[PDB]
Design an enzyme around this catalytic site. Sequence first.
Site, PDB file in Angstrom:
ATOM      1  N   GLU A   1      38.830  32.658  49.176  1.00 30.30           N
ATOM      2  CA  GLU A   1      39.626  33.754  48.866  1.00 30.30           C
ATOM      3  C   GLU A   1      38.456  35.175  48.233  1.00 30.30           C
ATOM      4  O   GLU A   1      38.516  36.056  48.648  1.00 30.30           O
ATOM      5  CB  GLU A   1      40.596  33.634  47.925  1.00 30.30           C
ATOM      6  CG  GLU A   1      41.824  34.808  48.025  1.00 30.30           C
ATOM      7  CD  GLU A   1      42.560  34.856  46.352  1.00 30.30           C
ATOM      8  OE1 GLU A   1      41.830  34.528  45.468  1.00 30.30           O
ATOM      9  OE2 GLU A   1      43.598  35.257  46.524  1.00 30.30           O
TER      10      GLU A   1
ATOM     11  N   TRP B   1      47.456  33.237  51.393  1.00 33.00           N
ATOM     12  CA  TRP B   1      47.802  34.536  51.561  1.00 33.00           C
ATOM     13  C   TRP B   1      48.920  34.611  52.736  1.00 33.00           C
ATOM     14  O   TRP B   1      49.244  35.748  52.806  1.00 33.00           O
ATOM     15  CB  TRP B   1      46.874  35.448  51.707  1.00 33.00           C
ATOM     16  CG  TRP B   1      46.283  35.849  50.470  1.00 33.00           C
ATOM     17  CD1 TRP B   1      45.080  35.199  49.806  1.00 33.00           C
ATOM     18  CD2 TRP B   1      46.416  36.761  49.590  1.00 33.00           C
ATOM     19  NE1 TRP B   1      44.633  35.819  48.717  1.00 33.00           N
ATOM     20  CE2 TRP B   1      45.510  36.956  48.463  1.00 33.00           C
ATOM     21  CE3 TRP B   1      47.449  37.956  49.528  1.00 33.00           C
ATOM     22  CZ2 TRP B   1      45.476  37.795  47.361  1.00 33.00           C
ATOM     23  CZ3 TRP B   1      47.550  38.974  48.420  1.00 33.00           C
ATOM     24  CH2 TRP B   1      46.592  38.885  47.498  1.00 33.00           C
TER      25      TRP B   1
ATOM     26  N   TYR C   1      42.908  42.933  47.721  1.00 29.34           N
ATOM     27  CA  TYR C   1      41.842  43.261  46.742  1.00 29.34           C
ATOM     28  C   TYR C   1      40.734  43.642  47.657  1.00 29.34           C
ATOM     29  O   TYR C   1      39.642  44.389  47.232  1.00 29.34           O
ATOM     30  CB  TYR C   1      41.348  42.113  45.917  1.00 29.34           C
ATOM     31  CG  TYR C   1      42.687  41.888  44.887  1.00 29.34           C
ATOM     32  CD1 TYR C   1      42.604  42.937  43.825  1.00 29.34           C
ATOM     33  CD2 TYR C   1      43.636  40.973  45.245  1.00 29.34           C
ATOM     34  CE1 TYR C   1      43.569  42.653  42.907  1.00 29.34           C
ATOM     35  CE2 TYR C   1      44.641  40.915  44.347  1.00 29.34           C
ATOM     36  CZ  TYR C   1      44.570  41.465  43.116  1.00 29.34           C
ATOM     37  OH  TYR C   1      45.666  41.552  42.048  1.00 29.34           O
TER      38      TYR C   1
ATOM     39  N   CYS D   1      48.021  42.570  40.557  1.00 29.63           N
ATOM     40  CA  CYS D   1      48.125  42.168  39.166  1.00 29.63           C
ATOM     41  C   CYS D   1      46.938  42.092  38.498  1.00 29.63           C
ATOM     42  O   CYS D   1      46.706  42.003  37.503  1.00 29.63           O
ATOM     43  CB  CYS D   1      48.508  40.452  39.414  1.00 29.63           C
ATOM     44  SG  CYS D   1      50.383  40.461  40.003  1.00 29.63           S
TER      45      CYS D   1
ATOM     46  N   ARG E   1      47.559  42.713  34.536  1.00 32.18           N
ATOM     47  CA  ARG E   1      48.959  43.387  33.940  1.00 32.18           C
ATOM     48  C   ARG E   1      50.003  42.209  34.070  1.00 32.18           C
ATOM     49  O   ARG E   1      50.947  42.360  33.178  1.00 32.18           O
ATOM     50  CB  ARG E   1      49.386  44.471  34.757  1.00 32.18           C
ATOM     51  CG  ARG E   1      49.584  44.232  36.347  1.00 32.18           C
ATOM     52  CD  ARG E   1      50.562  45.293  37.141  1.00 32.18           C
ATOM     53  NE  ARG E   1      50.816  44.640  38.377  1.00 32.18           N
ATOM     54  CZ  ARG E   1      51.970  43.909  38.891  1.00 32.18           C
ATOM     55  NH1 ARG E   1      52.834  43.760  37.682  1.00 32.18           N
ATOM     56  NH2 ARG E   1      52.121  43.538  39.863  1.00 32.18           N
TER      57      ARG E   1
ATOM     58  N   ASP F   1      51.321  34.755  35.880  1.00 36.02           N
ATOM     59  CA  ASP F   1      51.924  33.146  36.169  1.00 36.02           C
ATOM     60  C   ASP F   1      50.882  32.368  35.365  1.00 36.02           C
ATOM     61  O   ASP F   1      49.972  31.841  36.075  1.00 36.02           O
ATOM     62  CB  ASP F   1      52.215  32.897  37.570  1.00 36.02           C
ATOM     63  CG  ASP F   1      53.465  31.558  37.753  1.00 36.02           C
ATOM     64  OD1 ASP F   1      53.780  31.181  38.959  1.00 36.02           O
ATOM     65  OD2 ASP F   1      53.576  30.891  36.760  1.00 36.02           O
TER      66      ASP F   1
HETATM   67  C1  LIG Z   1      47.822  31.599  42.534  1.00 33.14           C
HETATM   68  C2  LIG Z   1      47.611  32.331  43.852  1.00 33.14           C
HETATM   69  C3  LIG Z   1      46.471  32.269  44.600  1.00 33.14           C
HETATM   70  C4  LIG Z   1      45.934  32.724  45.787  1.00 33.14           C
HETATM   71  C5  LIG Z   1      46.666  33.684  46.130  1.00 33.14           C
HETATM   72  C6  LIG Z   1      47.757  34.270  45.455  1.00 33.14           C
HETATM   73  C7  LIG Z   1      48.223  33.669  44.187  1.00 33.14           C
HETATM   74  C8  LIG Z   1      49.245  34.632  43.894  1.00 33.14           C
HETATM   75  O1  LIG Z   1      50.026  34.181  42.766  1.00 33.14           O
HETATM   76  N1  LIG Z   1      49.552  35.517  44.735  1.00 33.14           N
HETATM   77  C9  LIG Z   1      50.612  36.463  44.385  1.00 33.14           C
HETATM   78  C10 LIG Z   1      50.549  37.683  44.535  1.00 33.14           C
HETATM   79  C11 LIG Z   1      51.574  38.707  44.610  1.00 33.14           C
HETATM   80  C12 LIG Z   1      52.582  38.386  43.858  1.00 33.14           C
HETATM   81  C13 LIG Z   1      53.904  39.320  43.598  1.00 33.14           C
HETATM   82  O2  LIG Z   1      54.860  39.140  44.154  1.00 33.14           O
HETATM   83  O3  LIG Z   1      53.487  40.481  43.184  1.00 33.14           O
HETATM   84  C14 LIG Z   1      52.855  36.750  43.626  1.00 33.14           C
HETATM   85  O4  LIG Z   1      53.963  36.325  42.987  1.00 33.14           O
HETATM   86  C15 LIG Z   1      51.786  35.960  43.836  1.00 33.14           C
HETATM   87  C16 LIG Z   1      48.656  35.498  45.680  1.00 33.14           C
HETATM   88  O5  LIG Z   1      48.617  36.274  46.546  1.00 33.14           O
HETATM   89  O1  LIG Z   2      46.478  36.463  40.619  1.00 30.08           O
HETATM   90  C1  LIG Z   2      47.927  36.434  40.395  1.00 30.08           C
HETATM   91  C2  LIG Z   2      48.348  37.073  40.904  1.00 30.08           C
HETATM   92  C3  LIG Z   2      49.790  37.477  40.604  1.00 30.08           C
HETATM   93  N1  LIG Z   2      50.320  36.640  39.654  1.00 30.08           N
HETATM   94  C4  LIG Z   2      51.861  36.697  39.312  1.00 30.08           C
HETATM   95  C5  LIG Z   2      52.296  37.508  38.142  1.00 30.08           C
HETATM   96  C6  LIG Z   2      53.781  37.641  38.641  1.00 30.08           C
HETATM   97  O2  LIG Z   2      54.460  36.560  38.380  1.00 30.08           O
HETATM   98  C7  LIG Z   2      53.852  37.848  40.071  1.00 30.08           C
HETATM   99  C8  LIG Z   2      54.016  39.129  40.360  1.00 30.08           C
HETATM  100  O3  LIG Z   2      55.280  39.959  40.052  1.00 30.08           O
HETATM  101  P1  LIG Z   2      55.489  41.420  39.330  1.00 30.08           P
HETATM  102  O4  LIG Z   2      54.763  40.999  37.833  1.00 30.08           O
HETATM  103  O5  LIG Z   2      54.009  42.063  39.971  1.00 30.08           O
HETATM  104  O6  LIG Z   2      56.588  42.017  39.300  1.00 30.08           O
HETATM  105  O7  LIG Z   2      52.479  37.386  40.524  1.00 30.08           O
HETATM  106  C9  LIG Z   2      49.548  35.800  39.060  1.00 30.08           C
HETATM  107  O8  LIG Z   2      50.040  34.947  37.835  1.00 30.08           O
HETATM  108  N2  LIG Z   2      48.209  35.596  39.231  1.00 30.08           N
END
Ligand SMILES: Cc1cccc2c1C(=O)N(c1ccc(C(=O)O)c(O)c1)C2=O
Ligand SMILES: O=c1ccn([C@H]2C[C@H](O)[C@@H](COP(=O)(O)O)O2)c(=O)[nH]1
EC number: 2.1.1.45
Lengths: 311, 311
Positions: A60, A82, A146, A198, A218, A221
């Site tokens: 990634e 992704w 990104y 994020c 910002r 998880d």
């Molecule tokens: C742990 C993780 C590892 C690789 C790629 C991603 C994640 C990850 O959490 N999200 C992601 C991105 C955007 C949102 C979103 O809904 O804003 C989400 O919940 C997860 C990814 O693309």
């Molecule tokens: O690298 C990342 C990218 C995203 N998130 C999580 C945070 C939120 O749970 C979710 C996005 O939901 P919003 O906060 O964008 O509404 O993605 C992570 O923990 N790590």
Amino acid sequence: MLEQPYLDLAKKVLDEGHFKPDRTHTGTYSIFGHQMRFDLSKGFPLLTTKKVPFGLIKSELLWFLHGDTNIRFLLQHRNHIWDEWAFEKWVKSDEYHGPDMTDFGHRSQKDPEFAAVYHEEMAKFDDRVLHDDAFAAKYGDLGLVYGSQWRAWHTSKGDTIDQLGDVIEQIKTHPYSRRLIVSAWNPEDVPTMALPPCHTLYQFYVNDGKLSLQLYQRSADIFLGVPFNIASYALLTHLVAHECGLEVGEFIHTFGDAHLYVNHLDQIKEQLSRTPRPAPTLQLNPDKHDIFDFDMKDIKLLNYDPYPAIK
Amino acid sequence: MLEQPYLDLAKKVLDEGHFKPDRTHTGTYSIFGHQMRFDLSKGFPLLTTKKVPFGLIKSELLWFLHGDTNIRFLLQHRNHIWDEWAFEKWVKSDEYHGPDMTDFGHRSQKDPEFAAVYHEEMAKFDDRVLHDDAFAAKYGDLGLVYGSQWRAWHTSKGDTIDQLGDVIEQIKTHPYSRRLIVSAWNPEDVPTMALPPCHTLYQFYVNDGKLSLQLYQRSADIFLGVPFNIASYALLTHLVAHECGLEVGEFIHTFGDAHLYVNHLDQIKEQLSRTPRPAPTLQLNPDKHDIFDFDMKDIKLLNYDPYPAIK
Ligand SMILES: Cc1cccc2c1C(=O)N(c1ccc(C(=O)O)c(O)c1)C2=O
Ligand SMILES: O=c1ccn([C@H]2C[C@H](O)[C@@H](COP(=O)(O)O)O2)c(=O)[nH]1
Ligand SMILES: Cc1cccc2c1C(=O)N(c1ccc(C(=O)O)c(O)c1)C2=O
Ligand SMILES: O=c1ccn([C@H]2C[C@H](O)[C@@H](COP(=O)(O)O)O2)c(=O)[nH]1
């Protein structure tokens, strides 16, 4: 130990987090403004208390570093992290001729019936994207992720800027600059884009020949994302330090909102019973320097000895 | 006491700061990644250990909140804190017919000879800008300052976005959003603009009816700027909380680089001998709510009892 800030954050959200109802009929516990630091000279902060897949992080990060937003490159490295947001944009389109699956993500882990149909639809998608250039061009490309924010930021004049490339050149010529910043937050896109980033912004800083990085994140998880996030930016920090000929300093990880989902509570409690082990060490190709050209094989992790993965 | 994080930061940079040579043949001592928190329910964090002019902060903040980048509004409130960057752009131009003064800022506090000539040139400028609409339009307007980034961000399509206005509407409708962000960092402008913004980005967060704000500040003059910066964003936080009908939470102030100039060392040591007093309280017009229309008189500070100003 190197990773204790991650365990303290998890424990703090568990013991002092605020409850908020969540969109997907659940809830989170969160805190605002928490920071973690990791002195990268003491080891590489890949979590020992839960196995984290370094290969997926490497691939990634290299993807981002090419300015690439096509999942094809990731499919070629066996990285499906992704897939879903691309799968989502093709399944919503006119060319699609299979089962209904509106919000396949909710129905995802429920009935084992649909969960066999979807896994094969995703398996066909992945393979089309791999071998069909035209299909890949159309559905493989995520657009504003990104790779584009960091290396091809779209300007008002229809041009494009390489923020990260320009930043790295600044580290080499003006190491003490206070402007060594890469932003992923674009107020023009953020109102409509699928995923407002994020990992909002980051900044480098140099002192005594060591390179530090701070990330402002910002939203986080704590259980699923943070452990990956920590390793990507620590690796980013080593890679930039390598290209610039510097030693490695702190990685500082600063949050807006950091949360734990109200159904993920026992997984993180179980993890909090485990005891960190010595951290792995990273080795980088000592004869290569343009990180925009690095590949999988140029990055090695020694002596990574984790507890098992969690579910 | 409410302001102790400011004194701890100053003392930490004094005792553990890293030395870096600085552009203007000086040097700074700095640290990276420091954070301060201020619980705004305990009082208003205007520094008691040194008088900080709240009227200049109020007027500057109201300026930003109008989306205004013309120093005329500030001149009308007796606020000269932005004068110099405008003075600089007129003194560099073709219409200018007075003494030479290349880098008037270095020669500024040296010989009392030129320092009388410049103060009158700045006094004429200020007055032209005040009464000559055409001159004001041309030299009064700073262009890319907080007013424009926050409220009129320029999009690729030639349009303009009100980030802060849209954010505030989100606080009212989706208080638990994790996207309550206003950025001042525009990768397209930052390579050329006079002043890449020091107050890089900020984010709100709501819990239990209280509004918090975190600011990421990429670079900070601990002695001169930080005490103003803290009061602007604490006031911003109260004003937004007021418009939304919420109580006030934390203000969290997070730094990239925070520094102290190597010639300002004894002023801050002297300040570190002083003992905080109880913090002032803020009162806001209880019958007005659109902060984009607030004026000086709608904002009052009670019981502010500071030690003297420092030089
Ligand atoms: C742990 C993780 C590892 C690789 C790629 C991603 C994640 C990850 O959490 N999200 C992601 C991105 C955007 C949102 C979103 O809904 O804003 C989400 O919940 C997860 C990814 O693309
Ligand atoms: O690298 C990342 C990218 C995203 N998130 C999580 C945070 C939120 O749970 C979710 C996005 O939901 P919003 O906060 O964008 O509404 O993605 C992570 O923990 N790590
Ligand atoms: C305390 C302070 C109070 C009001 C307004 C300003 C400041 C301040 O420090 N700067 C500023 C802005 C930009 C630079 C810069 O050169 O980037 C600077 O040195 C000072 C201001 O405009
Ligand atoms: O609100 C502000 C604005 C600016 N600065 C200072 C930080 C730096 O000393 C200077 C800008 O120089 P650079 O860091 O931008 O190069 O402005 C502050 O302390 N507070």
